[PDB]
Design an enzyme around this catalytic site. Structure first.
Site, PDB file in Angstrom:
ATOM      1  N   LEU A   1     -61.851   4.407 -65.977  1.00 10.64           N
ATOM      2  CA  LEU A   1     -61.791   4.783 -67.417  1.00 10.64           C
ATOM      3  C   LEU A   1     -60.771   3.892 -68.126  1.00 10.64           C
ATOM      4  O   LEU A   1     -61.117   2.721 -68.386  1.00 10.64           O
ATOM      5  CB  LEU A   1     -61.398   6.260 -67.548  1.00 10.64           C
TER       6      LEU A   1
ATOM      7  N   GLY B   1     -58.487  -1.888 -68.100  1.00 10.21           N
ATOM      8  CA  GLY B   1     -57.415  -2.733 -67.537  1.00 10.21           C
ATOM      9  C   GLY B   1     -56.823  -2.140 -66.265  1.00 10.21           C
ATOM     10  O   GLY B   1     -56.729  -2.872 -65.255  1.00 10.21           O
ATOM     11  N   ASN B   2     -56.410  -0.868 -66.322  1.00  8.29           N
ATOM     12  CA  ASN B   2     -55.677  -0.168 -65.234  1.00  8.29           C
ATOM     13  C   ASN B   2     -56.549   0.993 -64.728  1.00  8.29           C
ATOM     14  O   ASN B   2     -56.562   2.089 -65.361  1.00  8.29           O
ATOM     15  CB  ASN B   2     -54.285   0.274 -65.695  1.00  8.29           C
ATOM     16  CG  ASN B   2     -53.540   1.050 -64.634  1.00  8.29           C
ATOM     17  OD1 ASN B   2     -53.749   0.822 -63.447  1.00  8.29           O
ATOM     18  ND2 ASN B   2     -52.695   1.977 -65.052  1.00  8.29           N
ATOM     19  N   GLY B   3     -57.275   0.734 -63.636  1.00 11.97           N
ATOM     20  CA  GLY B   3     -58.153   1.702 -62.957  1.00 11.97           C
ATOM     21  C   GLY B   3     -57.415   2.448 -61.860  1.00 11.97           C
ATOM     22  O   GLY B   3     -57.639   2.141 -60.663  1.00 11.97           O
ATOM     23  N   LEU B   4     -56.531   3.362 -62.255  1.00 11.71           N
ATOM     24  CA  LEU B   4     -56.079   4.502 -61.424  1.00 11.71           C
ATOM     25  C   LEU B   4     -56.641   5.804 -62.022  1.00 11.71           C
ATOM     26  O   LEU B   4     -56.440   6.842 -61.396  1.00 11.71           O
ATOM     27  CB  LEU B   4     -54.548   4.502 -61.348  1.00 11.71           C
ATOM     28  N   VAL B   5     -57.307   5.745 -63.181  1.00 13.28           N
ATOM     29  CA  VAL B   5     -57.979   6.898 -63.844  1.00 13.28           C
ATOM     30  C   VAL B   5     -59.494   6.653 -63.825  1.00 13.28           C
ATOM     31  O   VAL B   5     -59.926   5.650 -64.403  1.00 13.28           O
ATOM     32  CB  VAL B   5     -57.475   7.114 -65.281  1.00 13.28           C
ATOM     33  CG1 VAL B   5     -58.098   8.355 -65.908  1.00 13.28           C
ATOM     34  CG2 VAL B   5     -55.960   7.202 -65.330  1.00 13.28           C
TER      35      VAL B   5
ATOM     36  N   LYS C   1     -57.208  11.033 -61.747  1.00 13.79           N
ATOM     37  CA  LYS C   1     -56.048  10.107 -61.727  1.00 13.79           C
ATOM     38  C   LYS C   1     -55.595   9.902 -60.281  1.00 13.79           C
ATOM     39  O   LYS C   1     -55.184  10.886 -59.663  1.00 13.79           O
ATOM     40  CB  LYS C   1     -54.910  10.707 -62.554  1.00 13.79           C
ATOM     41  CG  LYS C   1     -53.700   9.799 -62.750  1.00 13.79           C
ATOM     42  CD  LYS C   1     -52.851  10.183 -63.938  1.00 13.79           C
ATOM     43  CE  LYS C   1     -51.760  11.191 -63.619  1.00 13.79           C
ATOM     44  NZ  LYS C   1     -51.020  11.567 -64.851  1.00 13.79           N
TER      45      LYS C   1
ATOM     46  N   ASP D   1     -43.099  12.862 -73.334  1.00 17.04           N
ATOM     47  CA  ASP D   1     -43.868  11.615 -73.575  1.00 17.04           C
ATOM     48  C   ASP D   1     -44.986  11.843 -74.586  1.00 17.04           C
ATOM     49  O   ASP D   1     -46.076  11.254 -74.450  1.00 17.04           O
ATOM     50  CB  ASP D   1     -44.388  11.037 -72.266  1.00 17.04           C
ATOM     51  CG  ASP D   1     -44.819   9.588 -72.412  1.00 17.04           C
ATOM     52  OD1 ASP D   1     -44.296   8.897 -73.336  1.00 17.04           O
ATOM     53  OD2 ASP D   1     -45.711   9.180 -71.638  1.00 17.04           O
TER      54      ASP D   1
END
Ligand code: MG
EC number: 2.7.11.24
Length: 294
Positions: A14, A15-19, A34, A133
């Protein structure tokens, strides 16, 4: 396309695919997953604190948690013998940051989303949980129903190597900039004020590139009314900022051109320099501007 364990299917990033998006095969329903990589003991401590906080939260304006998975994608029953864990949770269509990339909201949408954010905050503050955050990207939206849910409790703590450069400064209160170790309920409320303004204008209210610029931008627009605050600030801030805060700048009303007087007046009661003057989530919900939703 990938399976995770015996239960989750069609994992797509779902650039950074840890999600990932995935389908829960026991229901054929879309969920979010996640991946959390357990690198250090400072990363295990952050994983565990996040897992404990999110498990205890059920509210209409908080992203639901379904399951915690171990490295193999099988469910956890209750861990530094583990390279990784997965958090399975409510799939949400989008986040408020993606929505605001396409321009400002109608006041009526900004107001409705603000009412939901405050309801979410009243709830987590009642549990003594600080989010820490709050920013548009951690506010998840289902556009059909206009439902806003608070997510990403990554930085969240029970009230009681920094990576400082990866924490955005834009939603940080003056007290958080002066006293960085201490999160409070009032720090969440300052961030909600900044998010309300961004929904109204489509622009970051106070877009400082580091703590000092953030303080300068806030002092240019928000008055310091308490002597105690003024004395603390005069002994901490540099000469050029002290000079800058007797120079002329736009007040809040001119950072929000063409916005209704009622929205600006409500906002002025959230973006107070001192948390002692600031509406709590509960007081904000009971303010006329918000009680129209109750
Ligand atoms: Mg996020």
């Amino acid at each position: 396309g990938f399976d995770l364990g015996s239960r989750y299917m069609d994992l797509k990033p779902l650039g950074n695919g840890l999600v990932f998006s995935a389908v829960d095969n026991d229901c054929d329903k879309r969920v979010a997953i996640k991946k959390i990589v357990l690198t250090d003991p400072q990363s295990v401590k952050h994983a565990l604190r996040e897992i404990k906080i999110i498990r205890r939260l059920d509210h209409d304006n908080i992203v639901k948690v379904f399951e915690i998975l171990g490295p193999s994608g099988s469910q956890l029953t209750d861990l530094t013998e583990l390279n990784s864990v997965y958090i399975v949770q409510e799939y949400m269509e989008t986040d408020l940051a993606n929505v605001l990339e396409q321009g400002p909201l109608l006041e009526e949408h900004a107001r409705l989303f603000m009412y939901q954010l405050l309801r979410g905050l009243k709830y987590i503050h009642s549990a003594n949980v600080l989010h820490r955050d709050l920013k548009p990207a951690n506010l998840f939206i289902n556009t059909e129903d206009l439902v806003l849910k608070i997510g990403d409790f990554g930085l969240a703590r029970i009230m009681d190597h920094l990576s400082e450069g990866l924490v955005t400064k834009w939603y940080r209160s003056p007290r958080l900039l002066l006293s960085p170790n201490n999160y409070t309920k009032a720090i969440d409320m300052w961030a909600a004020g900044c998010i309300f303004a961004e929904m109204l204008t489509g622009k970051t209210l106070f877009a400082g590139a580091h703590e000092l610029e953030q303080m300068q931008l806030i002092l240019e627009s928000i008055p310091v009314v308490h002597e105690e605050d003024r004395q603390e600030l005069l002994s901490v801030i540099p000469v050029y900022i002290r000079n800058d805060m007797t120079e002329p700048h736009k007040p809040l009303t001119q950072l929000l051109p063409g916005i209704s007087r009622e929205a600006v007046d409500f906002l002025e009661q959230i973006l107070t320099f001192s948390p002692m003057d600031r509406l709590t989530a509960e007081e904000a919900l009971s303010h006329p501007y918000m009680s129209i939703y109750s």
